C-alpha cells in the first residue's frame, strides 16, 4: 500500500485515517489488510504527519499575534521541511522502480525524521506558552541553539540566522 | 475503482491549466476538491490520495485569482499585476509537460513535488497579499477606503515578507512586482496634476483624495477619510500649477539594502526636483 | 548503543567531547547497518540461503 | 485528432460541431473517440472560435449604418486577428513535427486568447448596442482604452491610433 503511506505523512485526510483539518484525527482501524501490528506503526507514521500540519498553521498564521520577526521565523522553517520534502520525493522513485516493496524502508526514513520533527515541535510550543513578541524569539530559539543533538542544533542555527538576517538589516539601514 | 496511476498526476497538471473541470470538483471559489476514487489494495494504496488533497488548495487560489480578474487603473493595473506574473508561472507549466510527452520521462508522482515546491511557496505568498486585499468589498461604501486600506495591506505585507527573508531575491523582486505596477497609475494622475494643471478623480470610486471645488474664490478641498509632507508638497503645487493657467504671464541583493524605503527616497527627489522648480516660477 | 544514543541528548550538558563521542559511535552505529543492507538484498529474488 | 480542433478554431461548420453561418451552433457529441470531459473543452474551445465569426460579419458589413471611421476602425480590428492567424500557422507545423501531440497545448494557445477575444466582444456588444455613428467610436474606443488588462489596453490603442489617424487626416486637408 505504497502510496497510501507518503500522502498520509504530507497531512492531507481519508476515511480510513479520517482527518477533519490540522488539530484531529480518529484511526478506524477496522481493516482487513493491515495486521495489528501494522496499523501500531501507522499510528507511529501519523504522529510524524500530525506535527507537520501543526506546523502549516503557523505558516498560514504568519504568512500568506505579529511582528517582523514572526515571518523572519518563517523562512527558517521552509528550511526545516525542505529536505524532508525532498525525501518526499525520492520515495516516490522507489515506488516505480519496484512496487512490491514493503512499509519498513519507510518506516526507517521516518524513524530519522523521529529526533527532528518533536525536537522542533517541543521548541514552538514553548514558543507559544510564553506569549512571545519581537527579539525574544530570537533569544528563545538561541537557547534552544544551545542544546545539542547535532542535526537539531545546526537547524535551530539556521533560524537563528536568518532572523539575524533580519536584525543585520536593522543596524545597516540604522547607520 | 482503478484510475490511472502517474496520469491523474498528470491530470492534475492539467486541470491547473484550463482552470474548470470534471476530475476536479471545484464549483465555487470558497470550496475546491477532489475525488478521484479509493485505488487497489497494493501499489500506493492512499499516500498518493493524500498528495491529491494537498494539491486540491493549490489549484483552489488560481481558481480564487482568476476569478479576481474581469473585464480606477489603480484597481485595474493591481490586477494586471497578477495576470502578468501569470506568465511566468506558465512557463513552467509547459516545461513538465514537455517532459512528461517525451518518452522517457523518468519521473513520477513524488520527484515532480520538489521541482514545483520553490513555485509553491511562491503562490502562497501570492494568496496572503490578494486574500489580505479584499476583506471589504461586499460591505457597501467601499470607495477610497477600501482603496486605502489595501495598499495599506499590500504595504504591510512587503514589510513582513522582504525584510525577514533577503536569502533569495528571486521572492524579493516579486514583491516589488506587486508594489512599482500598482503605484504607476497613482503616480501618473500626479505628473498630470502638476505639468497640467488637472488632475482625473472618478466618481464611483475615489483616490488620493485631492478634488477642485467648483468656485473661483475656492481654491482646493482635501477629502476627509469617513513621505506625508512630500504629498503635500504635490498638492501646493498643484494648487499653484493651477493658478499658473488661469493667470496669463508673458549587481548584488545583499549590498543594496534594503529596498523600498532607499526606491521612495529616490522618489521623493524626484517629486522634489517639480517640486523645487515650481516654487522658483511661482 | 542504540540506547546510548538515546541518553545522549542534552542540550550540551556536561561536556563538549561526551555527545561528539557519540556523534562518532552514531557513525560507527550506521556502518552496521549498510552491512545489515547487503544481507536483505541477499533473502528475496531478484546465492544460497543458509545459516 | 490535430487538425479538426485548429480548424473548429477558424470558425468553419461540420456535421460533428454543425453550424449554420455566423450566429448559431449544435454541439451533437454522440461521439465514440472523444471524452466526456475531452468535449467540454471543445465548447471552451468553441467559444474563442464564435467570436471570431461574430468578428467577420463586422467586416463584411462594413468592408466589401454608414461612416468614414466605421472602416477606420476596420483597419484596426485587422491588427487584432494578425497576431491570431499567426499563431494559427505556428500550430500547424506543432502538428507535422510530431502527429501524436494531444490537445492540450491548443488548449494552452487558447488560453492566452481567452482574455483577448471577449474583452474585445464585450467593446462592439456595447458599440452596437448604442447605435454609434461617427467621431463618438472614437470616443467609445477611448474609454475602452481607458480600461487595464495590459495587452488588451495596447490593443484598443491600436485601434484607436488608426482612426485618430483618419482624424490626422482631415484637420490636414482643411488647413
Redesign the interface.
Known amino acids: 500500500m505504497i502510496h497510501e503511506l507518503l500522502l498520509a505523512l504530507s497531512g492531507y485526510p481519508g476515511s480510513i485515517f479520517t482527518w477533519n483539518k490540522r488539530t484531529g484525527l480518529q484511526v478506524s482501524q477496522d481493516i482487513p489488510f493491515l495486521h495489528p501490528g501494522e496499523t501500531s506503526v501507522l499510528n507511529r507514521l501519523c504522529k510524524l504527519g500530525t506535527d507537520y500540519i501543526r506546523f502549516t498553521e503557523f505558516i498560514e498564521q504568519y504568512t500568506g499575534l505579529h511582528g517582523i520577526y514572526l515571518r523572519a521565523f518563517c523562512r527558517g522553517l521552509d528550511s526545516i521541511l525542505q529536505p524532508y520534502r525532498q525525501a518526499l520525493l525520492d520515495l516516490e522513485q522507489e515506488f516505480l522502480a519496484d512496487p512490491h516493496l514493503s512499509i519498513s524502508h519507510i518506516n526507517y526514513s521516518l524513524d530519522q525524521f523521529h529526533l527532528l520533527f518533536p525536537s522542533i515541535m517541543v521548541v514552538v510550543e514553548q514558543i507559544k506558552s510564553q506569549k512571545i513578541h519581537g527579539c525574544q524569539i530570537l533569544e528563545t530559539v538561541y537557547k534552544h541553539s544551545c542544546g545539542g543533538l547535532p542535526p537539531v542544533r545546526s537547524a535551530l542555527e539556521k533560524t537563528l540566522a536568518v532572523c539575524h538576517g533580519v536584525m543585520y538589516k536593522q543596524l545597516s539601514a540604522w547607520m | 475503482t482503478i484510475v490511472t496511476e502517474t496520469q491523474v498526476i498528470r491530470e492534475t497538471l492539467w486541470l491547473l491549466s484550463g482552470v474548470k473541470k470534471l476530475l476536479i470538483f471545484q464549483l465555487n471559489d470558497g470550496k475546491v476538491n477532489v475525488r478521484n476514487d479509493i485505488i487497489v489494495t497494493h501499489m500506493t494504496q492512499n499516500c498518493l490520495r493524500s498528495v491529491l488533497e494537498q494539491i486540491a488548495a493549490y489549484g483552489q487560489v488560481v481558481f480564487r485569482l482568476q476569478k479576481f480578474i474581469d473585464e480606477f487603473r489603480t484597481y485595474q493595473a493591481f490586477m494586471w499585476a497578477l495576470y502578468k506574473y501569470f506568465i511566468s508561472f506558465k512557463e513552467e507549466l509547459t516545461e513538465i509537460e514537455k517532459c512528461i510527452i517525451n518518452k522517457d520521462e523518468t519521473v513520477t508522482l513524488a520527484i515532480v513535488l520538489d521541482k514545483l515546491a520553490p513555485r509553491l511557496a511562491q503562490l502562497k505568498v501570492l494568496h496572503r497579499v490578494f486574500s489580505t486585499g479584499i476583506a471589504e468589498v461586499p460591505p457597501d461604501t467601499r470607495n477610497v477606503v477600501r482603496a486605502s486600506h489595501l495598499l495599506n495591506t499590500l504595504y504591510k505585507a512587503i514589510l513582513d515578507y522582504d525584510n525577514v527573508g533577503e536569502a533569495s531575491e528571486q521572492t524579493v523582486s516579486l514583491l516589488f512586482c506587486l508594489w512599482v505596477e500598482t503605484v504607476r497609475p497613482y503616480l501618473e494622475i500626479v505628473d498630470e496634476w502638476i505639468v497640467h494643471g488637472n488632475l482625473f478623480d472618478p466618481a464611483k470610486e475615489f483616490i488620493i483624495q485631492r478634488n477642485k471645488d467648483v468656485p473661483f474664490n475656492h481654491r482646493d478641498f482635501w477629502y476627509a477619510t469617513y513621505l506625508k509632507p512630500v504629498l503635500k508638497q504635490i498638492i501646493m503645487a498643484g494648487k499653484s500649477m493651477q493658478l499658473l493657467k488661469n493667470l496669463k504671464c508673458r549587481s548584488e541583493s545583499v549590498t543594496c539594502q534594503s529596498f523600498e524605503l532607499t526606491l521612495r527616497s529616490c522618489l521623493y527627489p524626484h517629486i522634489g526636483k517639480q517640486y523645487l522648480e515650481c516654487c522658483g516660477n511661482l | 548503543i542504540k540506547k546510548y544514543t538515546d541518553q ?6 556536561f561536556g563538549l567531547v561526551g ?2 563521542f557519540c ?1 562518532a559511535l552514531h557513525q560507527e552505529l550506521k556502518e552496521y547497518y549498510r552491512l545489515l543492507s547487503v544481507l536483505h538484498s541477499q533473502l528475496q529474488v531478484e546465492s544460497s540461503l543458509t545459516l
Chains 1, 4 share one sequence.
Open positions: 545522549r541528548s542534552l542540550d550540551r550538558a555527545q561528539s556523534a
